Each structure stands twice: as structure tokens, then as C-alpha cells.
């Protein structure tokens, strides 16, 4: 199905569809940390003294995991904490047909979480009986239990994030309110209010479609906008593979910890995999040799886990830097970058909070219902050559019109919408036609 090319026909779209495309990016990962000594030497002084001969290996590993855990707070701050003031949407939804109830918070819900973030939090689930959950039981929501709770799980510990899921949802609500009430202006300055139909009209004028297109099709565009967001909920529910990037992060971290703990069951060439038996069954001199084999194996296991987390944390940081760029350029502005903020011409985007991630709903303009018209580069009228100021010359078969590129709005060829340069003998493909002059009928009286 190739596109037929000819040197004098142009296909111009006579219609459009507004569409919404969902984008999901990870932002952070669970702030887990692992104590070197409690992992290698479980409540054991003989193992601790032998480990001291290895120098800074424990303290180096603790610094590495602590650094990763602090990067996670930075990632979340860089993405969501962009909004400086907590703006709020008006209680009345007289936006001119545009229904944002699917993305705005619900007062009826127990949490100020929108009906799309409700599906997002109910669809991203961590592993069943995973240490991330199991740690929540011995901790009992009491900070004082951390030392005892960490002792049970071989030194593994999970740290609470500096921004809770409730605070992160609050920031997206401010981002959403600012966008609907002030357009671009809350990202660059004070929040200059503007009616939403006029705001949307300037999104149209940005992609190169005149603003009168919106005001004359305002009801149809609002219906297209509402139906597109309505399809998002069904698309997310009926497809549980849409949150694969967020689950991938959670699964990779869970599989790392599970393997790290199971390494404690390996003998590593010693006489037994349990330190208590080596110390209670064997001669006191004969124990150091067996413990060294365990220490070497367990220290190498921890080093492997730490390096993997370092590489993976860098990968998530790259995704978090991208989410912050998409927040500024897709949500707080209108991007001219073609596939950055969705496919089609970018109109606007809406951030939605997700577990350790963000979801962007990119509203874009897609041309539809193309028709082919004969075209010419210029017009000969009085020996002079006339070029369109904006748009293209098209012919419906007998008459010539000038129309905008991205929508079929034909207009009479006039001195107002054309400019003159050169003469007829230079331009290749020039055509003879009349050019209307608004002053002549006034002088015709």
C-alpha cells in the first residue's frame, strides 16, 4: 500500500481526531539497605573479628547502598516537586464540555486519588510474601522495631520514602489544577488564569491550526476528548500488561534480595553453611579456617548484589531524568519535538501518580480524512508571481483556493493572504489565475 507520488497533487486532511496516548516511566525504587556485618556474621563475635581483617569492605558496601537509597528521594523530588504552589481546581466543571473527572481527585474516595490512579495503585502489586511485605509485619509500623526487625531478616531493611504516596498525589493534583486553570503560564511565572476553550485554542494555534477551527468545532472536540479519556480506563483494566515497566522494577529488586538471602544457604567450600554448627561442633582453633571460607563466599555474594544495584540504580535514574524532562516540557508547556510527548501533534499532557512511577496521558491532534487536490507553487496574475503567506494553493477542479496546511479551509486567493515576489518566467510550475483585490469593489461604487 504505497503512497502514490505526483509532482502536482497534495493531500490535505479535511478532519481530525483528538487522541490520548498513555506513557509510563519508572521514577524510583524501594529504599532497601543491607548491613554488611549482620548479613555476613549473624550475632557472632568470632566472625566479626575475622571480618575486621578485611578492612573497609563492609563500610564501603554500606556507603554504596545508602547512596542508592538517597538517590531515590532525589528522583521523586526532581519529578514531582516542580510545582511551587498548591493550586486547586474550581468545584464547578463548566470547562465548556471538557470532562476532567477521570483525572481529577475524587472527594468521595477515602483518599484524594483520581479514578485513574485508583486503577494504577490497584494494578501494581509487589511480590507475594516478599521481604518488602514481610518486613512490614515485624516492623509493626513502629520505628523502634527497626533494629530487631532487621535482625530477623538477615540485616535487610527497607527505609520509608521522604514523600509519601499521599504527598506525591497532592503534587500531581497541583500540577493538574495549574494546567487546567492557567495553561503554560504557571510553569514560567505567576499562574495567569485563562478560560479552557481559549487555552485549548492556543494549543491548536501552536500546532499550526487556526483558532477558529476549535471554536467552530468546540462541541465535537470536547466529545472526542471525553471519549478518549474514557477509553484509557478500559484499556488499563482489560490489559494488565500495560504496567510492565513498573512491575519490571519491582520484580528485579525482589529477585535480587531473594537470591542474596538464599546465598546464606551455600557452603562456599566450608564444612557447613550455618555458623553456629561450625562454632559449636568443631575445635576452637579449627573454626577460623571454616569461617573464613564462609566469610569469603558471603562477602563476595554481597559485593555482587551491591554492584548490580549500583548499575540498576543508574538505569532508574536515567528514567527519572526523562520523567522530569517530560513533566516540564509536556505538562508545563507544548512540545515541538515530534514523538516526545506522544504521537501526533502535541496539545497537552496530564500527569498521573503511580507506584514508583508516573503516567502521562498525552493529548494529541491527529489529521484524518485526507483528500487530494491539485496544487501549484505560485500564481501568475499581472506578470507578477504570488506566493501564499500561510498555507498552500489548491484546486477543486476549476477554481483555485488558498488553504492552511493541516486542515481544508479554502479561501479566495487575495492580496491579503498572498505576497508578491519576482515574475512569472522564473518559478517552475507556476499557474495563471486571478487574485482578488479588496480595494477594487470599494472603488467600484
Amino acid at each position, epitope marked *: 500500500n504505497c503512497v502514490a507520488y505526483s509532482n502536482n497533487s497534495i493531500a490535505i486532511p479535511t478532519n481530525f481526531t483528538i487522541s490520548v496516548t498513555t506513557e509510563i516511566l519508572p521514577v524510583s525504587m524501594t529504599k532497601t539497605s543491607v548491613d554488611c556485618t549482620m548479613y555476613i556474621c549473624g550475632d557472632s563475635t568470632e566472625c566479626s573479628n575475622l571480618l575486621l581483617q578485611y578492612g573497609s569492605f563492609c563500610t564501603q558496601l554500606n556507603r554504596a547502598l545508602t547512596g542508592i537509597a538517597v538517590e531515590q528521594d532525589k528522583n521523586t523530588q526532581e519529578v514531582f516537586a516542580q510545582v511551587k504552589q498548591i493550586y486547586c481546581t474550581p468545584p464547578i466543571k463548566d470547562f465548556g464540555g471538557f470532562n476532567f473527572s477521570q483525572i481529577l481527585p475524587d472527594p468521595s474516595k477515602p483518599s484524594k486519588r483520581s479514578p485513574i490512579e485508583d486503577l494504577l495503585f490497584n494494578k501494581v502489586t509487589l511480590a507475594d510474601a516478599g521481604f518488602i511485605k514481610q518486613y512490614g509485619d515485624c516492623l509493626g509500623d513502629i520505628a523502634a522495631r527497626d533494629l530487631i526487625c532487621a535482625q530477623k531478616f538477615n540485616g535487610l531493611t527497607v527505609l520509608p520514602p521522604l514523600l509519601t504516596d499521599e504527598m506525591i498525589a497532592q503534587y500531581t493534583s497541583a500540577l493538574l489544577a495549574g494546567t487546567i486553570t492557567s495553561g503554560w503560564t504557571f510553569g514560567a511565572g505567576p499562574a495567569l488564569q485563562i478560560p479552557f476553550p481559549m487555552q485549548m485554542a492556543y494549543r491548536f494555534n501552536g500546532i499550526g491550526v487556526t483558532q477558529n477551527v476549535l471554536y467552530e468545532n468546540q462541541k465535537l472536540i470536547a466529545n472526542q476528548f471525553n471519549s478518549a479519556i474514557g477509553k484509557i480506563q478500559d484499556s488499563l483494566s482489560s490489559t494488565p500488561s500495560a504496567l510492565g515497566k513498573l512491575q519490571d522494577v519491582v520484580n528485579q529488586n525482589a529477585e535480587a534480595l531473594n537470591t542474596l538471602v538464599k546465598q546464606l544457604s551455600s557452603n562456599f*567450600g566450608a564444612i557447613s553453611s550455618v555458623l553456629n554448627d561450625i562454632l559449636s*561442633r568443631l575445635d576452637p582453633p579449627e573454626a577460623e579456617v571454616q569461617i573464613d571460607r564462609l566469610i569469603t563466599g558471603r562477602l563476595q555474594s554481597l559485593q555482587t548484589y551491591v554492584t548490580q544495584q549500583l548499575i540498576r540504580a543508574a538505569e532508574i535514574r536515567a528514567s527519572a531524568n526523562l520523567a522530569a524532562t517530560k513533566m516540564s516540557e509536556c505538562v508545563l508547556g507544548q512540545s515541538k519535538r515530534v514523538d516526545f510527548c506522544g504521537k501526533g501533534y502535541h496539545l497537552m499532557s496530564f500527569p498521573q501518580s503511580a507506584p514508583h512511577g508516573v503516567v502521562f496521558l498525552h493529548v494529541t491532534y491527529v489529521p484524518a480524512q485526507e483528500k487530494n487536490f491539485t496544487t501549484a507553487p505560485a500564481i501568475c496574475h499581472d506578470g507578477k508571481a504570488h506566493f501564499p503567506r500561510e498555507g498552500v494553493f489548491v484546486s477543486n477542479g476549476t477554481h483555485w483556493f488558498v488553504t492552511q496546511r493541516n486542515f481544508y479551509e479554502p479561501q479566495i486567493i487575495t492580496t491579503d493572504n498572498t505576497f508578491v515576489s519576482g515574475n512569472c518566467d522564473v518559478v517552475i510550475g507556476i499557474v495563471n489565475n486571478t487574485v482578488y483585490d479588496p480595494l477594487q469593489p470599494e472603488l467600484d461604487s
Partner: antibody
Amino acid sequence: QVQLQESGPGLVKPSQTLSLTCTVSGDSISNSSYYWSWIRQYPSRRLEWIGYIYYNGRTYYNPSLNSRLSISLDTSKNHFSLKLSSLTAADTALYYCARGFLGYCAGGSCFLNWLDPWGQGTLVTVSS
Amino acid sequence: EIIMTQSPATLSVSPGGRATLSCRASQSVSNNLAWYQQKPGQTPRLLIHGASTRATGIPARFSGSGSGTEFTLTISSLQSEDFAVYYCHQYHNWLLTFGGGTKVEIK
């Protein structure tokens, strides 16, 4: 199966050296699966472990009599021996030689298993 | 050392009855226990090894149980020849040690 037979002087003067020999038939003392031990039994039915030697010659002794004791093996004749010095009247007991099974071994150390069988046992009297 | 205490120093059981013998360790000896039978003037015979694995050729009436610290040997049908001294023994630690022995008298 294996059979163990003790031999030694039944009457030894105090402050003399006791020498016991346990000849092993049906097995080689160099078999990697065994350790060979000495246990003495008192008239009060009390059993006391004296010491054992691995097939490769590694010896472990009871600290209660560590400074008086040595155990050795001879691969030519398949027997292991006990030498107990500084004998007192408290050393009068019934000395058994027994074959133990070695357990899991790694890195030059072994866990123990049970003793089976015991030798017939030789009675040693320490008196003038 | 792991001191091993056998609770009944002597036990009088009617023929055909049931005898229960207990052995207590000072610290966990795990499953590393054995029970030895010494008939009067004879060599000790291994009855049970591990916690409860009966040795080959031992009547099914001899049953051992326990783990960690408390262990129990039970004789299910006291024949006339089961009169002996029964020793528990631990091979958990190096420096293996024996209990005091229970003399199972028969009425």
C-alpha cells in the same frame, strides 16, 4: 565385619606408663571413613572418653588428661595405641577401643558420627 | 563440655511392660545422639543412632525420640534379655561424652 582386640598390661605400677594396643582386623586403619577412639569405664558405670585418632593421624584428647596422653596408629600392623603416663590409682578402669564413623568433611575438618563397634575391653589396675 | 544427664538412674519394669528412658543435654546436641545397650559384663551395643534411626538388627520394640536437648528411649515390650545398662551418647561436639547409664531392672 570389623573386629577390635585390646592388649596391654593388666597391672601397672603407679607413676609408670600404660601401653594399650588395639589390633584391627577386617578393615584398614587408613580407611578414610573411620576414626579410632579410646573410652574407659569405671565401676560406677561412668564412661569417660579418652581420645580418638583419625585415619590420617590427627589426634584429639580429653582435656581432663591432655597432658598425660598420646595416641598413635601403625599402618603396617593395623593397630592404634594408647600411652598414659603419670598413672595414679584413679586410672583403674576398663579401657575400650572403638571404631567411629566420620561424618561430613571439608577444608580439613570432619564432623563425627557414632561409635560402632566397641572392642572387648581390657581391665587395667594401677597399684604397687 | 556438653554434660549429658540421664534422669532415672534405675528403672524397674515388669516383664512385657513399657520402659521409658530420658536423656538431657546441657546444650543443643541436635539429632546427634546415640543409645548404647550394655548387658552385664559385655560390650556396649548400638541401639539407636541419629535422633531416632534404629540400627540394623535392632528389634522394632526399641524406639528413640527427641531433638535438641530432651531425648527419650522407649522399650515397647520388655523381654527377659532387655535387662541392661543403657547409655546415651552425643557426637555433636568434638569431645564426645556419655550419660550416666540407666539400669533397667526387670520384676
